[PDB]
Amino acid sequence: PVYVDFDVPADLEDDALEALEVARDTGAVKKGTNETTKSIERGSAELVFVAEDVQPEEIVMHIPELADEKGVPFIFVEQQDDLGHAAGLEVGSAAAAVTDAGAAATVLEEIADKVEELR
Amino acid sequence: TVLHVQEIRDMTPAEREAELDDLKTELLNARAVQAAGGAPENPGRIKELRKAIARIKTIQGEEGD
Amino acid sequence: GKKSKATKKRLAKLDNQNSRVPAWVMLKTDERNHKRRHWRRNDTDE
Amino acid sequence: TGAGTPSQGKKNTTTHTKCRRCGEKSYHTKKKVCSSCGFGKSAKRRDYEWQSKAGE
Amino acid sequence: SWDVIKHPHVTEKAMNDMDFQNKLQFAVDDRASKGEVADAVEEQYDVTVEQVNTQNTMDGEKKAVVRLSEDDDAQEVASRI
Amino acid sequence: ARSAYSYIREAWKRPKEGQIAELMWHRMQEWRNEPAVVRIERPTRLDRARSLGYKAKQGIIVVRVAIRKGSSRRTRFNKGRRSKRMMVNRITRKKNIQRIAEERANRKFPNLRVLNSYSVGEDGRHKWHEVILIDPDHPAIKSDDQLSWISRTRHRLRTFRGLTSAGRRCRGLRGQGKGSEKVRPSLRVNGAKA
RNA sequence: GCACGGAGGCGAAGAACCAUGGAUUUCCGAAUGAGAAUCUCUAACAAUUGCUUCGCGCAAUGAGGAACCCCGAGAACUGAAACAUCUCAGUAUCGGGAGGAACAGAAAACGCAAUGUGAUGUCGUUAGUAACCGCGAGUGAACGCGAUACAGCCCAAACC
RNA sequence: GCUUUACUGCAGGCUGUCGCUGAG
Ligand SMILES: [Cl-]
Ligand SMILES: [Cl-]
Ligand SMILES: [K+]
Ligand SMILES: [Mg+2]
Ligand SMILES: [Mg+2]
Ligand SMILES: [Mg+2]
Ligand SMILES: [Mg+2]
Ligand SMILES: [Mg+2]
Ligand SMILES: [Mg+2]
Ligand SMILES: [Mg+2]
Ligand SMILES: [Mg+2]
Ligand SMILES: [Mg+2]
Ligand code: NA
Ligand code: NA
Ligand code: NA
Ligand code: NA
Ligand code: NA
Ligand code: NA
Ligand code: NA
Ligand code: NA
Ligand code: NA
Ligand code: NA
Numbered sequence: 152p153v154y155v156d157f158d159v160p161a162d163l164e165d166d167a168l169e170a171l172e173v174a175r176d177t178g179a180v181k182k183g184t185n186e187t188t189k190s191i192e193r194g195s196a197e198l199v200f201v202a203e204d205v206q207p208e209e210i211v212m213h214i215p216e217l218a219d220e221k222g223v224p225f226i227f228v229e230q231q232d233d234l235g236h237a238a239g240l241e242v243g244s245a246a247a248a249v250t251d252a253g254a255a256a257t258v259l260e261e262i263a264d265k266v267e268e269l270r
Numbered sequence: 271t272v273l274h275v276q277e278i279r280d281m282t283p284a285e286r287e288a289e290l291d292d293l294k295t296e297l298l299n300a301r302a303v304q305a306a307g308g309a310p311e312n313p314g315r316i317k318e319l320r321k322a323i324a325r326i327k328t329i330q331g332e333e334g335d
Numbered sequence: 336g337k338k339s340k341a342t343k344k345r346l347a348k349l350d351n352q353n354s355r356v357p358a359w360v361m362l363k364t365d366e367r368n369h370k371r372r373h374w375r376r377n378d379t380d381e
Numbered sequence: 382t383g384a385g386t387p388s389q390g391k392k393n394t395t396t397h398t399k400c401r402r403c404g405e406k407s408y409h410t411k412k413k414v415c416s417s418c419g420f421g422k423s424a425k426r427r428d429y430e431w432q433s434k435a436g437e
Numbered sequence: 438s439w440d441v442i443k444h445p446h447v448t449e450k451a452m453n454d455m456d457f458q459n460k461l462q463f464a465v466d467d468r469a470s471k472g473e474v475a476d477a478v479e480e481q482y483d484v485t486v487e488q489v490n491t492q493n494t495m496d497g498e499k500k501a502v503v504r505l506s507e508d509d510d511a512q513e514v515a516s517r518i
Numbered sequence: 519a520r521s522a523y524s525y526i527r528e529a530w531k532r533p534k535e536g537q538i539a540e541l542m543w544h545r546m547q548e549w550r551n552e553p554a555v556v557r558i559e560r561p562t563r564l565d566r567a568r569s570l571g572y573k574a575k576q577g578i579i580v581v582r583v584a585i586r587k588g589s590s591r592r593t594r595f596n597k598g599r600r601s602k603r604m605m606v607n608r609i610t611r612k613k614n615i616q617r618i619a620e621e622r623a624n625r626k627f628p629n630l631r632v633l634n635s636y637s638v639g640e641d642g643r644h645k646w647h648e649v650i651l652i653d654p655d656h657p658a659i660k661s662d663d664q665l666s667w668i669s670r671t672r673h674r675l676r677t678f679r680g681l682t683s684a685g686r687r688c689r690g691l692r693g694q695g696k697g698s699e700k701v702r703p704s705l706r707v708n709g710a711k712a
Numbered sequence: 713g714c715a716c717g718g719a720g721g722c723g724a725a726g727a728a729c730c731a732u733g734g735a736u737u738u739c740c741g742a743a744u745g746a747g748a749a750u751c752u753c754u755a756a757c758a759a760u761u762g763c764u765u766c767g768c769g770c771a772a773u774g775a776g777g778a779a780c781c782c783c784g785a786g787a788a789c790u791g792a793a794a795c796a797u798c799u800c801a802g803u804a805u806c807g808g809g810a811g812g813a814a815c816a817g818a819a820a821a822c823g824c825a826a827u828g829u830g831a832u833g834u835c836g837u838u839a840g841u842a843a844c845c846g847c848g849a850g851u852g853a854a855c856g857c858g859a860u861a862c863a864g865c866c867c868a869a870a871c872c
Numbered sequence: 873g874c875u876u877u878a879c880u881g882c883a884g885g886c887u888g889u890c891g892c893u894g895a896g
């Protein structure tokens with residue numbers, strides 16, 4: 152909400168999650184806000200996901216601007232439990248980072264484009 | 271006295287209860303005789319009747335009935 | 336006044352405590368009830 | 382009307398009674414509070430340091 | 438566990454009730470109801486209780502005036518104790 | 519590299535700036551409509567909580583408590599007093615608001631014990647603190663080598679005896695040297711002069 | 713039983729009596745199903761909480777105790793030959809709470825300034841010294857030293 | 873105990889200022 156400056160259409164979010172699932176199987180992904188933050192800082196992040204139902208918002212507030220000054224692309228997901236399930240967790244996840252996609256580097260790279268265009 | 275602990279344990283759960291209800295009756299009749307100013311008393315027993323009843327209840331508890 | 340069952344029990348007890356030390360107790364102790372209470376001169380509780 | 386003897390005649394009202402919790406004739410049946418043990422007012426038992434000399 | 442009947446209440450008045458009204462008088466536990474007294478009495482003396490009247494006495498005990506049926510005789514039930 | 523937690527900390531250094539400033543303006547509206555003690559599923563300042571001992575584990579509880587701002591709510595004297603003791607307006611309690619907050623939370627959860635607490639801001643008349651409480655009877659805590667110490671009988675009602683975080687600082691026990699002559703080992707043992 | 717009467721009884725089937733352990737243990741009482749001056753009315757962890765199979769299923773709290781202990785609230789008589797700051801005094805008293813002891817405790821210390829000491833209580837001393845004060849009356853430490861007893865560790869984070 | 877333009881203070885009322893507190 153305060154850290155969300157653009158709305159991601161339902162369909163875009165699905166493509167994103169889908170890509171994330173093939174990422175945990177084919178490539179590499181980081182689950183959890185602390186491990187995600189470190190990707191963006193270490194530059195190893197290619198696409199970071201951030202839930203929008205995070206309370207307190209403090210936990211994720213920094214992702215956006217941090218991602219911006221690091222060139223890393225990011226996309227918002229409405230449900231926290233969807234991101235966690237997509238990432239492969241039995242629990243939810245406030246943030247995730249596809250650390251080097253897998254059999255999705257295409258669809259992925261394009262999701263990053265659609266979002267950059269989503270302003 | 272007239273009724274020892276061994277003898278109570280040698281009784282079956284059903285014999286203790288039958289013996290129990292029997293002592294209560296002797297007791298009740300002793301109190302009746304007493305309530306009627308009856309002198310054919312023997313104080314040592316109305317007291318023994320109480321202890322005997324206590325023993326039986328104690329044993330029923332130890333044995334599990 | 337209207338007494339309850341419990342009050343009635345207490346007064347019954349007070350009446351009972353109002354008896355004298357049995358004679359036999361004098362002989363057994365080789366020799367007074369300090370809790371003697373008259374209804375008029377004394378006052379019970381409650 | 383004299384405040385002494387003549388005013389003593391109307392005293393047939395029951396207030397303090399034998400308390401269920403402490404046994405003292407201090408349970409005020411009008412207030413439903415014992416002035417001796419605090420029953421009706423406090424779960425804890427009524428007690429004060431001034432009930433004895435300061436150093437005792 | 439407490440017993441219902443405590444003992445027969447035997448006094449001049451209790452005798453008149455026994456001899457003239459076929460009633461028996463007992464000292465019972467003050468927690469006992471008329472019904473409990475009626476039952477207890479029948480089971481102990483094998484008789485038919487027709488009516489029970491109670492009173493919480495100034496002795497701290499409860500007194501029950503139990504009337505038996507014309508089929509039973511108080512005088513006899515009391516004579517065996 | 520920087521932990522994600524370090525960002526929550528950085529934000530809270532200046533609660534009236536940036537995004538947090540707006541969150542607060544949002545949140546307080548709901549807080550002001552909430553009760554004295556409200557159990558919350560997650561700590562508003564995660565870094566703070568973990569730093570104080572918080573763990574996402576069973577038997578660990580967090581609660582936000584509201585307490586009025588200002589000096590002592592004091593009644594004026596009803597009998598003789600020398601001028602020095604006729605005071606009302608400027609008298610302030612010797613126990614800080616955070617400590618009051620810890621006690622109120624603790625009384626709401628009679629079976630739990632206070633582990634620590636921290637501030638989450640204030641408006642014109644309230645001050646809010648989140649208190650971390652622990653269930654000393656829940657295994658998982660009894661079996662945690664870092665929190666089990668709080669399960670000891672000697673720790674029953676820690677806050678009420680000033681054995682807490684804020685309790686010890688408010689008691690003047692911070693310094694180990696100059697200034698703590700009337701403070702350590704206890705205020706009462708020193709005749710109550712600190 | 714105290715308690716030495718009368719009657720009767722128990723004990724060699726080892727009683728009495730003592731130690732330890734067990735049984736029984738009414739009602740009110742924190743008092744907890746609800747109400748009530750110790751009783752009563754028609755299944756009960758009432759109330760507040762944690763966990764939770766989200767069902768009082770598993771648990772916690774409540775109240776007591778000679779004083780001691782810890783955290784809060786906090787006088788006045790009195791002394792100053794009056795009295796206001798000061799003093800009595802952080803005393804009396806009040807609120808909350810622990811234990812068998814509490815509390816304190818491994819330095820953002822000390823500062824005999826050092827090439828030195830080395831967690832914390834407490835006792836002796838330092839000393840009625842330094843410091844406070846209508847600079848009046850009064851108030852009043854600490855470091856160190858000699859003893860007692862000695863004990864040192866765990867998280868948060870980085871990296872996983 | 874009481875009084876007052878006795879001494880000294882303390883509630884309370886009025887009023888400025890700061891925080892809550894923001895946009896042009
Ligand atoms: Cl506590
Ligand atoms: Cl030194
Ligand atoms: K004075
Ligand atoms: Mg008489
Ligand atoms: Mg008068
Ligand atoms: Mg009637
Ligand atoms: Mg001490
Ligand atoms: Mg009840
Ligand atoms: Mg003077
Ligand atoms: Mg002078
Ligand atoms: Mg002083
Ligand atoms: Mg020093
Ligand atoms: Na009288
Ligand atoms: Na009788
Ligand atoms: Na508590
Ligand atoms: Na001080
Ligand atoms: Na017992
Ligand atoms: Na309970
Ligand atoms: Na339940
Ligand atoms: Na003087
Ligand atoms: Na004077
Ligand atoms: Na002075």
Ligand code: NA
Binds near residue numbers: 824
């Ligand atoms: Na030296």
Ligand code: NA
Binds near residue numbers: 873
């Ligand atoms: Na006067």
